[PDB]
């Protein structure tokens, strides 16, 4: 059955810290504990070892990722930007 | 098509002789009752001849040119096939699968390969075959 | 302690220059021959009484032999 109506994972904190902070941290708690698909092997095993460090239990490949998400929007934008400049550097 | 044929140079991947180079003598792609899997009889170099240079005497060169060979039957999965071939004529009356019944025949099978390898080594042909893979 | 299985090896043990004494212990089921060498106490367990008597009379000379009671 559905046990909570809205708190979800942040139900571990009971009534403490205020609704808005619990609401805000709920997005991170889900993301930082999710298992992401590993781009190197495909098994849904990529898990966070520490803040910024993401490890896959299948192929053992460790990746420097985001604090709470596997890759950040800023980092993904920079990779495309660095790709384009490289092409326009060597044509 | 099929390429695991006699004369093919292969790299042993697993076992005591892993990383050594051998040459397929007999290949059985369908197996037998004793070996349901596909396998080959290969003869290879247990110990490679040491590097020689003009600075050494004849006695030193001969000492460093000896080869320790081995005879084995291998699963195809344990051999990496290369594109090199070595056409050393090995007497199949002594280099065959019956050499594994007793050591006396196996000693004469490894002896036969040792003499043929050394003779072909000193001609300077098949240099890649007699150089140890560095891994 | 080491356990010897065959009379052939025990006799070799008892002839070692560092073998000191042989104690014979008679139990209800077996006869045990123990030789005190330098490192180990080797033991031979013989279940046949006749062989135990035969082995007893065929020990090397000069070795102290003791019967335990």
């Amino acid at each position: 059955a559905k046990r909570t109506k809205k708190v979800g994972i942040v139900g571990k904190y009971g009534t403490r810290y205020g609704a808005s902070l619990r609401k805000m941290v709920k997005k991170i708690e889900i993301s930082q504990h999710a298992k992401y698909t590993c781009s190197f092997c495909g098994k849904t095993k990529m898990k966070r070892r520490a803040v910024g460090i993401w490890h896959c239990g299948s192929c053992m490949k460790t990746v420097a990722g985001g604090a709470w998400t596997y890759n950040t929007t800023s980092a993904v934008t920079v990779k495309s930007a660095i790709r384009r400049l490289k092409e326009l550097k060597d044509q | 098509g099929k390429f695991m044929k006699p004369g093919k140079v292969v790299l042993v991947l697993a076992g005591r002789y892993s990383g050594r180079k051998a040459v397929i003598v007999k290949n059985i792609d369908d197996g037998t009752s004793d070996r349901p899997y596909s396998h080959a009889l290969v003869a290879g170099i247990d110990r490679y001849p040491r590097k020689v240079t003009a600075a050494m005497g004849k006695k030193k060169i001969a000492k460093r040119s000896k080869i320790k060979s081995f005879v084995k039957v291998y699963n195809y999965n344990h051999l990496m096939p290369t594109r090199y071939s070595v056409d050393i004529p090995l007497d199949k009356t002594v280099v065959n699968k019956d050499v594994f019944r007793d050591p006396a025949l196996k000693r004469k099978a490894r002896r036969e390969a040792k003499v043929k390898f050394e003779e072909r080594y000193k001609t300077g042909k098949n240099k890649w075959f007699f150089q140890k893979l560095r891994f | 302690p080491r356990k010897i299985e065959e009379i052939k090896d025990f006799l070799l043990t008892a002839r070692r220059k560092d073998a000191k004494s042989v104690k014979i212990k008679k139990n209800k089921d077996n006869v045990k021959f123990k030789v005190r060498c330098s490192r180990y106490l080797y033991t031979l367990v013989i279940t046949d009484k006749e062989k135990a008597e035969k082995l007893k009379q065929s020990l090397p000379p000069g070795l102290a032999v003791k019967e335990l009671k």
Partner: protein
């Protein structure tokens, strides 16, 4: 029931003060001090999580009095690298060395035309 005491002056439950119970010929329970648990070697590949096989799992200074056969495996890198990653280096070393010849031949062949 019988209650136990340490047999040494270290009265604390430290990592070097672990014990196990032992009944003796005198028919009493005493403490025997256990040796630490040894660890088998970890593969030099740094990738495989498991430890190696064919090697005694003993404390580092106990390897001094073991024979060689107990400390390695009959194979290249045996006792220092796992078989799985040894197969991979032979292929990698061979396959990479071949690509150099392929690249080199084209370089000379392209230069030949040039």
């Amino acid at each position: 029931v019988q209650r136990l005491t340490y047999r040494r002056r270290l009265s604390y439950n430290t990592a070097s003060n672990k014990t196990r119970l032992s009944r003796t010929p005198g028919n009493r329970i005493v403490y025997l001090y256990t040796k630490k648990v040894g660890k088998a070697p970890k593969s030099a590949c740094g990738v495989c999580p498991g430890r190696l096989r064919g090697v005694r799992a003993v404390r580092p200074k106990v390897l001094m009095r073991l024979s060689k056969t107990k400390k390695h495996v009959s194979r290249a890198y045996g006792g220092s690298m796992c078989a799985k990653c040894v197969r991979d280096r032979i292929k990698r070393a061979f396959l990479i060395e071949e690509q150099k010849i392929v690249v080199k031949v084209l370089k000379a062949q392209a230069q030949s035309q040039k």
